[PDB]
Swiss-Prot record, chain D:
This is Large ribosomal subunit protein uL30. NCBIfam families: rpmD_bact. Part of the 50S ribosomal subunit. GO terms for cellular component: cytosolic large ribosomal subunit. Gene3D superfamilies: Ribosomal protein L30, ferredoxin-like fold domain. GO terms for biological process: translation. The keyword Methyltransferase does not apply. Keywords: Ribonucleoprotein, Ribosomal protein. GO terms for molecular function: structural constituent of ribosome. It holds the Pfam family Ribosomal_L30. Belongs to the universal ribosomal protein uL30 family. The lineage of its organism: Bacteria, Thermotogati, Deinococcota, Deinococci, Thermales.
Amino acid sequence: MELTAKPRTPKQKLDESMIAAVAYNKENNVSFALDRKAFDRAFRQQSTTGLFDITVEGGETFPALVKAVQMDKRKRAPIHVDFYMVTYGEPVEVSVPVHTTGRSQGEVQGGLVDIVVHNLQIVAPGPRRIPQELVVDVTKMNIGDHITAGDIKLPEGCTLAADPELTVVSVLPPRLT
Amino acid sequence: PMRRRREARTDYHQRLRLLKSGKPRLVARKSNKHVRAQLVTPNGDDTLASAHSSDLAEYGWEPTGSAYLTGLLAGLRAQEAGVEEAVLDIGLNSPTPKVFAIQEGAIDAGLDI
Amino acid sequence: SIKPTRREYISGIPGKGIAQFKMGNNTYPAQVENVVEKPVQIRHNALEAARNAANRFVQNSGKFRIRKFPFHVIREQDGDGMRAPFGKSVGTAARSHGANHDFIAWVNPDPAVEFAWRRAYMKVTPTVNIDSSPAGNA
Amino acid sequence: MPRLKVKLVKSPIGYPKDQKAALKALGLRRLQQERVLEDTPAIRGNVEKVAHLVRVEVVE
Amino acid sequence: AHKKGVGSSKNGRDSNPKYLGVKKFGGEVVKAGNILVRQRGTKFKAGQGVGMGRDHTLFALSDGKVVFINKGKGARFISIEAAQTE
Amino acid sequence: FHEMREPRIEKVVVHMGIGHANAEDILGEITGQMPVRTKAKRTVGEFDIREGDPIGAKVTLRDEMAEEFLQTALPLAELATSQFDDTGNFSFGLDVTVNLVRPGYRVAKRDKASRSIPTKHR
Amino acid sequence: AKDGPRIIVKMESSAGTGFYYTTTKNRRNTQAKLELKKYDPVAKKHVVFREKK
RNA sequence: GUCGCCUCCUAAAAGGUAACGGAGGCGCCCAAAGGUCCCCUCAGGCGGGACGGAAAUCCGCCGGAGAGCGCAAGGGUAGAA
RNA sequence: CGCUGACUGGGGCCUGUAGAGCACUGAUAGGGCUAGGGGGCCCACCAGCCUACCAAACCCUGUCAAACUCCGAAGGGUCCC
RNA sequence: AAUCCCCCGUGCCCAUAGCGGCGUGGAACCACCCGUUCCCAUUCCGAACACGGAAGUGAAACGCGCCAGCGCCGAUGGUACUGGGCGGGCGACCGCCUGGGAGAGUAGGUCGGUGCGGGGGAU
């Protein structure tokens, strides 16, 4: 949303209210613009979890946003970001999240819980074609069970930029099973 | 391993053995179907198609003779250039009776080996 | 930064003796956690402990995860007196590099675990930083 | 032929070995005095390194 | 009349390896590159090494000397343009 | 091309070996390609602790030779089943094995582009 | 040298007379009264060479 | 306690420096690990069969050599020692 | 002896800490797949069966090293101009 | 005989050539091939090394092409570390001013590029 800059001035820039952030795209880049105030708001929403874009000179109103960056620093306040769009029908490198609900199985009865080393899902469905919020939770939880890649259950866009059997999300003893 | 330490069979380094010095790499490349040798001499040297089974057709005298000549001649072709004492090049296999053959060539070829 | 004699000649190859990592429960978004800023060969023991007392006060779901762990150690009085000092080991930990990802109180809506960790900081030693993660804490 | 005109300041008293040489080199006797030279990255360098040393002026 | 234990304490002594003559100086039929004595010198400079490329020593005479593996025995001649007709 | 995959011999051993002198001489007379290899280990599961002795006997025999043997030796063996192992190959008896030879076997011999022998050819 | 009746024993070898000898260290270890090889005494050159002493 | 000598680390990146600072080896040996000329392609893992169910022996696949080199380490390095 | 010297500019060639990194190695945590020990069940030469406790090794999420490093700068060196 | 397409000996650049998946070639080339008295030769057999020769074949090694899954290469903007200069905190240490500025991390790039000679293939 907006964000400007692109000359050659990171220090002061990298200072005050404007944080660096390259204009990255397949084939071309352009001095860092943006701002340490927009990043906020938007970013605050769900960086590489949905997507939008800003109007700098109406130039090229496109999506793709961030494919890297960091609040690095100790303090925990980012500085020096990466920005890449995608006006193509190739959209792959697509990492969008996936949520459950709380389906009661090991929890609200077994107190047991479940780790989700997954959460996210870098895949590649129908380029410029993804539900900013995709949910899938067949339920199940408790004892020494576990679910991961393999099973899963992918809708429409048949990608999987990923593999089978691997960090899905299981149920462990928040105390004992 | 480094390219030449995971494959097998060659000895190229037993070529570099003579590399050090002594003269032309009177290297004799074989392929049954025929024999073909050059003359890799030190300094990004080169060669002078000194002897080949095709150069002058491939005849019909098999191994024996072939060599016997290919060499000789070869040796003939070169000593016209201005060489003299050239180092041998077992290129490959053991100075088999072929090999040995060609070999003769050089020797008889008057190109000292 | 004086450190030890080697990873297998003086004292290197242990379990360091402690109480493992993970606790609490999952959670996809909710980013609930703790880190620091202080530098200190984190007092093993003190360490191990601390964190633990953490579980002692909570119990289940709240990433009682914790990303620390000592692995080297000091030494002192053993032998003659003060001069040519040989070495007698004791007390390993790990450098808390001037702040960083401590342990995580990670989960949907379960501050009943935030306060916890909280109780977890209180403890500890080198001050500590009370914080949230990508998004905050819900 | 950018001619450089530097002056003397903050006595190199006890300060880095070399640094001094860059002193006697560029041509640096008594204190707070003024000398000039051609750009010449050479002479240039030295002086610069000496930086804080004193003050450079583009003259002729 | 013996010696003890549980006192590791065992200082170490001296060496003296180097690249003597480093790369590209006035070459003199003398100790080329060093890091393995008994060494077996070579011809001119050396470029073979557990690194990749090679090293030239714009200095040429009889020969130099190796170090057993390190550096990378010489052989890729390189007398230097300073070896032509007077 | 059905003129490919369709087989054409390929090796085929037949041996023995005891924690030992000559017994292999009964081996020489039955064929002609003496096996001289040294087994070993260091325990007492037979009194074979000796970890560096000459007891391993193995009379290699592919093609040509093996033929005379596959022949004069294939009659006294009574089975034909199970003893059929994956890697197109198999081992029965006082010690004997023989390997298949589909068209995609050799390559696994090259020092270079050593195609880890695909599992659809073998 | 450090004379050590330990399989460590120093010896030489004549030159059929070529005259004198030449240096050598040894070890009964194996082949006792065993020790032969050629050289070249001030005597012309070469010459068989027993070692025993 | 300890003094000689071989290696690592310490040396901050040329070289090189204390510490009663860290850890570990040597006062052997090999007549054949000698000289060359000629051939070899490791450990291991997996799959198939004698005496064999760790752990061989052979046969068929996979392999910046992780085995290999009398001895401590470290460099080396199959092209090969 | 007389411009050669500390120093700077240029040009090669080197070292490879700090950092960082995990495929070499040794740690080490959350977990998945698995076989070793369990463990409860046909009574158990059964070596057939399920599964909540410990594990080895491979796989994902992670992390420490002076005597680890596929990676690699600050800089210092040395010959020439 | 002093131009391109191809195969063959073969060299430099030490994986932007390796792995592997499919494929194509045999007039020419090359191998596999056909046999084994004599040269030589296997600690066991002429499998490999090897001498003589057609038919047979492109299966295999092999050569050119397509495929990013494993690998290899790898910028820009960016953060650590720091040569030099100067300030804060008793404190482990923090910061500033000026030139140097990596790895990993997304883009993407790669399925070699290029020497000399020999056989042809282009009156």
